[PDB]
């Protein structure tokens, strides 16, 4: 598909659902969600299945479509 559904849960138990271009990278995803989650992109750490997502990698590489990613500040 052309786009990915990505859920983001913060430590305060808020879960938001985003729909983004399927080739979007992690740095760009942080920028996409920053206003919604009220955490500046440079202060975001994203975690999925035990691992910290790296800025230069594509979301798709982590196979997160339809899945929950956790977001922590700093």
Q: Classify residue 25 by its DSSP letter.
A: B
The experimental method, as deposited, was X-ray
Contacts 24+ apart (CB under 8 A), 56-59: 56/25, 56/26, 56/27, 57/25, 57/26, 58/23, 58/24, 58/25, 58/26, 59/4, 59/6, 59/20, 59/22, 59/24, 59/25, 59/26, 59/29
State how far the alpha carbon of 18 is from the alpha carbons of 7, 8, 64, in Å. Answer: 6, 8, 12
Tokens matching residue 39: 């955490």
- What are the strands, taking DSSP E only, across the chain? 3-10, 15-21, 44-48, 51-52, 67-73
Contact present, 22 and 3 (Cβ < 8 Å): yes
Q: Which domains does the chain have, with CATH numbers?
A: 1-74 (3.10.20.90)
């Amino acid at each position: 598909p052309d786009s990915l559904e990505v859920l983001v849960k913060t430590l305060d138990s808020q879960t938001r659902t985003f729909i983004v271009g399927a080739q979007m990278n992690v740095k760009e995803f942080k920028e996409h969600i920053a206003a919604s989650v009220s955490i500046p992109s440079e202060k975001q750490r994203l975690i999925y299945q035990g691992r910290v997502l790296q800025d230069d990698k594509k979301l798709q590489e982590y196979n997160v479509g339809g899945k929950v990613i956790h977001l922590v500040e700093r």
